[PDB]
Design a protein around this ligand. Structure first.
Ligand code: NA
Ligand code: NA
Lengths: 301, 305
């Protein structure tokens, strides 16, 4: 039993982290087969961080301006291209530690693990979620750009996030591994602000189902609700609307515990109205929204 | 910026995990050099688990009774030996992935990373602390026995924990890699219960410093206190005593933030005596105590391995 926020084992990703340097700037890259992926702003200088013209900047670069270091080895860049906001450096050597992998674009509410790196060396691993406003509440210091987020299923690593920047609110923004940003953000240092963040409702309900599994029932009630009445209420607490897709995703947990999905919604509505009265659920005094319905079955059932 | 519960990168340990099978029981083993380590209760069965004699059960076993499996490769056991509560299986192959490593025993309040495995397959990693009552609040389902806990320093892995059992409270108990239990527990099917737990005070203080470093400052006040006066309040609320050594260990963070430890203790005192007034610290409504001062310095400085 017990319920921890759990991250994926990071070994398969550790063997892919490299250091990429252009002029004065050094950040992390991802070495897979004979390609190193990194954020394109590694070619940006102090002078033009507001309105960098990446096409004009990249055409002026030679292969040997890119310094790639895998551990103690220096890799030879033999070609370069840009795909949206991700730089792709072709190297002469394929990474022998390349795992089975794919690139996936995730949706808000989905969870993944982050391997925070500095100078191509791993610092630590943690679990997090894509917030509804397309940011992540990460732990990133200067030089962490290029760290990646991933899931692991069987033996296949699905890369879903690359870190690019921190916003004034302290939260973080990045791209998928095809270089498309999550959310309405751009790799420019002009004024940008995250949209108002909300709670991932389907994840909260999943975590309340996990509590019942693990034996906790003090928050249940005899009421049910209509989907619409629930959303009217939850929106007033800055909760994400619940869709019929979400209701279907929770179908399995509703079976294993015998509590109908709209029944559990009534309990959540009551918790928002009352708080926890000094009590806790699964060791937390706040409602947790970074466990997906999938994670809950992974770790419980 | 940002602050998260962060585990060590686990690659060096994933290369050492194997599956051990004896009779009906299957659990995880740690393969280092030419030895596999695992809990000795793998040789137990239904009849014996209530009151076993591990001396006697083991001399009855033969090397061929132990099926050791590294991925899809099978290791030949050529010797078996017992050290306290861990079984040592000698194999005919040294693990080519053996890291630089060391066996250490940790103290209550210290933190480590756990690589939870099932059938020898690493499944997840999380950060936890050795509670003052010598349990860990982990996440383990059947088949996770033999999962290990570790720290990393520079390039060296310090193995400090091996999981053995779950307690009726849902918390977990285990040993160091020399087979000595943490806490007053035995590897038997007998009535066992965790002692009453307390909160790791020096870690709460470390976490308050982390909140300040990240710009969360509402709980600070103008007041200072005395080690003696705080400890009488701490004991009142089931907090661990704060020793002078704890104060020195927090020195770096007090110098980096300008809040003396006893200045911060006053803030913690007021939080114990008044609550959180309906607001949070680093996104938590409870006081976090699973970050050590060293953990805080390292996440805020960016040390790598
Ligand atoms: Na209900
Ligand atoms: Na104070």
């Amino acid at each position: 039993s017990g319920f921890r926020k759990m991250a994926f084992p990071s070994g398969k990703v550790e063997g892919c982290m490299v250091q990429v340097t252009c002029g004065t700037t050094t950040l992390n890259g991802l070495w897979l087969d004979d390609v190193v992926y990194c954020p394109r702003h590694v070619i940006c200088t102090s002078e033009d961080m507001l309105n960098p013209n990446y096409e004009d900047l990249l055409i002026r670069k030679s292969n040997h301006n890119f310094l790639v270091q895998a551990g103690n080895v220096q890799l030879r860049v033999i070609g370069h291209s840009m795909q949206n906001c991700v730089l792709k450096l072709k190297v002469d050597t394929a990474n022998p530690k390349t795992p089975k992998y794919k690139f996936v674009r995730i949706q808000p509410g989905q969870t993944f693990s982050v391997l925070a790196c500095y100078n191509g060396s791993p610092s630590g691993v943690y679990q997090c979620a894509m917030r509804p406003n397309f940011t992540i509440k990460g732990s990133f210091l200067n030089g962490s750009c290029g760290s990646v987020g991933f899931n692991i299923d069987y033996d296949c690593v699905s890369f879903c996030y690359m870190h690019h920047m921190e916003l004034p609110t302290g939260v973080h923004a990045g791209t998928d591994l095809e270089g498309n940003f999550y959310g309405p953000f751009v790799d420019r240092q002009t004024a940008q602000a995250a949209g108002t963040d909300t709670t991932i409702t389907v994840n909260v309900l999943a975590w309340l189902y996990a509590a019942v599994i693990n034996g906790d029932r003090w928050f249940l009630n005899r009421f049910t609700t209509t989907l619409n009445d629930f959303n009217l209420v939850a929106m007033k607490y800055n909760y994400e609307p619940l869709t019929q897709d979400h209701v279907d995703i929770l179908g399995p947990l509703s079976a294993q515990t015998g509590i109908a999905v709209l029944d559990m919604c009534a309990s959540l509505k009551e918790l928002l109205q009352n708080g926890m009265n000094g009590r806790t659920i699964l060791g937390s005094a706040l409602l947790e929204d970074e466990f997906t319905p999938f994670d809950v079955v992974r770790q419980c059932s």
